[PDB]
Symmetry: C6
Subunit: 318 residues, 6 copies
């Protein structure tokens, strides 16, 4: 509903990229569950623990029952097949979940949710005030009721300023979240690229069970290897875009030095020099709202100015 | 809810065509997943890497187990079968998603969403104003309250004009989106038509595994080839309609030269010559609203006229 | 919500018949997907490309593997089985979708949706007016506020009349939609009845593959033939009802000659002779609302009369 | 929402019984689809087209492949198995749907829906009127506004009476619906009880195919016979309850002779003798509302009385 | 929404226990449907219609086809397996449904739903009245409007008292429902505990079919026996808790003798001795609301007192 | 909706951890249901009830049918496989459910839900009062209406204080719930860690059935052992976090000694020394609201002060 203005474009993009990652994860998961197959055969002639690979033709006879193939299938799936091809989608699901948690933690966390809902309530009831457009147009009789409403609103804004000025928690939380995203990004890229090549269609496996079948080695096929490879490539691509976005966010924030809102633009333009600069934890919100729309900041700044209140006193006193 | 007036008929048609494309994609996808079968047999007599195709009859005996057929099935599915027949529906899903993204990007993007929600809020509160129908009927006592509401509304419209006049971002974004749609259209038509013919029911494949079975070549059948061919034909047809719609949109926009709203019709008809012409990024919106219903433009234009304000001053002063 | 009054009983019936058709389509579709089986056997003795059909008994031995039966199954399913039994439900789904599109096109189309939402808004705010019941009861002090509301409402109705009088698009669209429904009805009845008989339980098929099996001909069974026959009969029955409804609609509209709303009933009854007749594109709406409830037309007609306005002037002037 | 008062207890019970019938239908349907099995075997020794039923033991050898059993399965399922055991749940679904249609037709039908929504709107705005409780308490200064509201309400009720008095359609529709329910009830009981006994676990079938297998007769088993028998018993029981309810409804309506609302109770009790009796199509509604709660009828009857209006004139005139 | 105050804690617990019972029923149902397996083998040596149970080892050869095992499976499943293991979850579902029906019958039943919605509407509009807190604080100028509202509210409460005093239906219905719950509880415990032990993993069955196979007896296994046993134990435990709750409810109601609300506490405390005792069918509601929160009863009792009305007359007369 | 302020951060974390636990439970459950497989083979040479594990190679022949493998599979699954590997996910589901019950019991329980909804209603209508910000700003003409509203609000707060002061039930319930969570935590950790190691891939089982097959021992494989081991590790980790959170909660509550709200901070700061200390069952709520946001406590405390009421008397009297 109302927190769309808080979320910037980068957070919006992350929100949908997470859905796409989760989608491919769920699909790979159900695809793994429904088949989870390998197709294994023996190898009669062995050379260095591998196949030699050396009147019409006739089929070869191995003298095996259907149920022994499934046993050797399960064994060569358990032991010699590599864990990544098994557990790829579960990991992706876990990662997407903890991304989303790192994103929405500071919304769900009450200490900050209270400050944010109070801030936005103040901002909207200020923007919807009637006296603002008049004050901006001035660069003369008004209703006593809305005059008193504005008068109480000034005091509310002052108390809110005094309350928010102390905290400085939101900056720290958002900082920690971005850093967690970036380090986790790097970590997943590392082992994903390192272990992607091990997915293969064909596998030789020597499991050492003579007594049950009488064959040493086996050659096996994993049909889903190609598809999981495609999904992994698409995955790491989306991940790359996500991490570049997070790096841009981090650079923006650390560069701006944004604990202090400079504010000088409006006071020179609108000729209200008697406005102080803002302190920590109330400037960050203004920067966020500025990324959405600069208009809200200007509409809110008028109540902060004491000159506006001094003028409003004249209209109530009349 | 309220953005239905912004969307023109072509965007409406695209919205439903995307749903149809997504529907056939999901269906082909689940159909591929649940079977993903081929039925492969050997070929005893070979001529040029192909079958010679040369007391009651008797069945032929190949001396193969059930589990070897599945191995050769997986192999001839992996190697010699063509990637398009495998991965047709996934590509279609991807394309539909990126179409929808290109369509709804300028709605979800905050810099423009703010301008649009502000514009439409202004337009609706102007259309719902009581003084408009009276002003149009004039071609005399009014309430001081609604008079002051209108008076503030003029100032709001002026500030909004000054704000929107600068940007010119919406035109660029919509331009880029249409062009992306058209080039992506052409690209998908190209390889889709080039590779559709390779889907076939029957396939000969030579995989070179003598040691496991003792047969060189194999003849295989893919039942879903016909159905995927039908779906691909239906797909490219829908795509053609989509691209022709996009071309019409592009021609309309580039032809109209619409940064400047000509406006001359109302001023001659309603005898309000003292209205300036509109500049970039506020005309495009008027053209869009004109495609929906011309009435909103006329109802909104009265507040822009200074003569209307001059007359309204007389009614408030009385 | 509010467009229920626009929809007549025939459109209501079509709306639910489409749901039933879609239901049987989805069911036949999933039933086709989950089995898609035939059961094929060879035929040892052949006479004219067909079976001769000529110490306890003993089973017959064909010397075939399980995997060859599936191959010949796929072949005799692809080639000699008839396309209608395969693709019956998909066609039904397509038809139902394009029926629904032809039904809801003039609602979703913005040029007409604007006129309709404006019309119905006017009608409801007129019906909810307090002065109407008094004016009808007359066959005396009123509030100045509601008097001015009614006075502005007369002007709104006049502007709306002048706006709607020109168009004549809604009649053309509804005409085209009904005709599309009727011609498509006839087309589907034609080939459905012509090709329904080809569905059969038992099929003889000669596919000409000696090298793979050594048998010429095959006898095959399709279990779902009976069920699809039942569904097709039920389908064509529902379709017949739909088409008869559409024919009734078409006859009604072409017979009534409804561009001109005759209107003579109320003016003779309520003694308001000074009301003009209505022109194109505003009469069609009145006929539709008359099919729902004649009361709305009478309650709306009073504002159109100039005598009512002349009398209302006396009450405001007092 | 508001039509709960219209629905009597019998219609409420029918509404839930239909859901239960639909539930068992859907369950039997999916159960039929997922198995649809029979298990068929041959019979070596035949006596009168039936089985004679005449060193450790040894298994019997029939020399049949797995794929021939499925063929004879499909054949003996198609031909000799009885259609009721196949198509039981589909019929039940159809019946439940047409029951629900017969129930909700007069709600969905616009000609009557308009009358009903208008009636209930009048009744609720009368019940919520403030003057009613005072008038009942009388067995003295009031607000001019609510006085005028009541005064207009009398005229609205009079116009509504004149409008509704003519129709007499609702009685005919409800009559037809009840009769359709009762005759359809009897019909389904008839063939359901006549054909339930044919469901059996074991079946002998002689299909006459020597050339494909060399056996004349077959003995087959249908596992779901018992379960479908249980569901059919439960079905006919629920149906019996439904039909007895419908018979009670029919007897009630035909006995009461309810076109004329007798009304004599309130006029003797509350001493308002000057109220006429009610005519057709406005009494039926009062009887329905009486079945829910008699209070609404009494609260509504006061406005119908002319004495109440005569007294209200004194309070407005003061 | 508003009936949460009517429901006591025991009804709340029953509501969730029914959901848990339904959950285990649905799970056991789908588990039964998807497998419904037994695994049957013959027994070569027989002693008293049972198995005697008496160079490497070698497998035993019975000379049976795959399709005969399924036949004997179906037979030994139909005949000798016990009906409880088959139809356990369906019964549980039926019981849960009829529990829920017995719980919500007096809400859905209109004759009582009208009384309850009217009662609660009165109670809430009384609790939200402004004069109540003042009257309680008294142990002096008020608005004429709210004074008249309260004055009409007294009359409404009096009429409602006279209406509700007669009925005494709600007590009878709730009594019948509790008793049905208790007797049905006892019945299900009886046969559930009596027949639970018959579920077993291993079963010997003698079906008497020599001609089809040549074996007399069979030994069979039912894998789901253990799981259904666990579910049945959990089921009867939940059922026990449910029945003990119902017994507590029954004892409470029969002990309290609650047709007469004693009421003596408030009149001694708040010094309003001039309040009569309450009669049947209006006391039961007060007891229910007392179980939720005693405050509503006290806030409502003030309007019942005539002294409160006598005092309120002085404030309106001033 | 409104109870988000009551829930602290620890309860929030528990709420989502329960969803994750339930998710892994449902997944392990469906995974168990769909396969529930073991793959068992015999062992020809036995040494101490275990396998000795001692011209191309040839397959071994056991002379067993497909249906005997399934029998021995079911037997070795029933008897020698350990119950934990079977019933792991059901237990997890049960635990998660009873965690959620212990969490939401005091919300669903009516005796406390009434007190809480009344408390929060009072708090919100106090926070939304206009006089509070003025009273805080004072560290002078007001509307008589809101003055009387505040005056009644003081009395409401006093009655509410007297009502809540007695109970002391909420503290006991929350205490019991935390303790149940901690003891159940310890219990599940105990047997989970004790029995996790018994899950294994390979199992030897001696079932003692010579007559049916002629083999003593069997070697079996359980593919899902690894996956269930991973899920169990992840489970116990989440559980550990949950229990540490619960221990922190318990330590906080027992340490604070919170029946008495110390309150001294505001009276020294805002110079309102004439406020008493709070008693049991009204302090706990204040501590909870303090964990969310301290501002509500301060905004509410002003009405509790008698000095504020004494000052408000002057403004109403004027």
């Amino acid at each position: 509903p109302a927190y769309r203005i808080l979320k910037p474009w980068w957070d919006v993009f992350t929100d949908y990229i997470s859905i796409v990652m989760l989608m491919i994860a769920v699909f790979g998961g159900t695809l793994q569950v429904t088949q989870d197959k390998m197709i294994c055969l023996p190898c009669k002639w062995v050379t260095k623990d591998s196949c030699n690979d050396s009147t019409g033709p006739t089929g070869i006879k191995y003298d095996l029952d259907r149920h022994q193939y499934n046993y050797v299938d399960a064994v060569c799936y358990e032991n010699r097949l590599h864990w990544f091809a098994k557990y790829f989608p579960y990991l992706v699901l876990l990662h997407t979940l903890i991304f989303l948690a790192c994103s929405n933690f500071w919304f769900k966390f009450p200490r900050t949710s209270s400050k944010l809902e109070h801030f936005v309530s103040i901002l909207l009831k200020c923007f919807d005030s009637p006296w603002t457009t008049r004050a901006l147009s001035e660069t003369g009789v008004l209703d006593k009721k809305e005059g008193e409403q504005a008068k109480a609103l000034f005091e509310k804004v002052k108390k809110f300023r005094t309350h928010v000025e102390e905290g400085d928690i939101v900056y720290r939380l958002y900082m920690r979240q971005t850093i967690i995203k970036v380090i986790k990004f790097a970590l997943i890229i590392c082992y994903t690229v390192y272990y992607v090549h091990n997915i293969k269609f064909d596998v030789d496996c020597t499991v050492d069970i003579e007594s049950l079948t009488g064959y040493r080695t086996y050659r096996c096929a994993h049909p889903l290897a190609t598809l999981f490879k495609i999904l992994a490539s698409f995955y790491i691509s989306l991940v790359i875009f996500y991490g570049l976005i997070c790096m841009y966010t981090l650079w923006w924030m650390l560069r701006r030095s944004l604990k202090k809102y400079s504010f000088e633009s409006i006071r020179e333009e609108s000729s209200y020099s008697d406005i102080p600069d803002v302190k920590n934890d109330f400037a960050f919100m203004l920067h966020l709202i500025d990324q959405y729309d600069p208009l809200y900041s200007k509409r809110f700044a008028v109540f902060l100015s004491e000159v506006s209140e001094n003028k409003l006193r004249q209209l109530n006193l009349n």
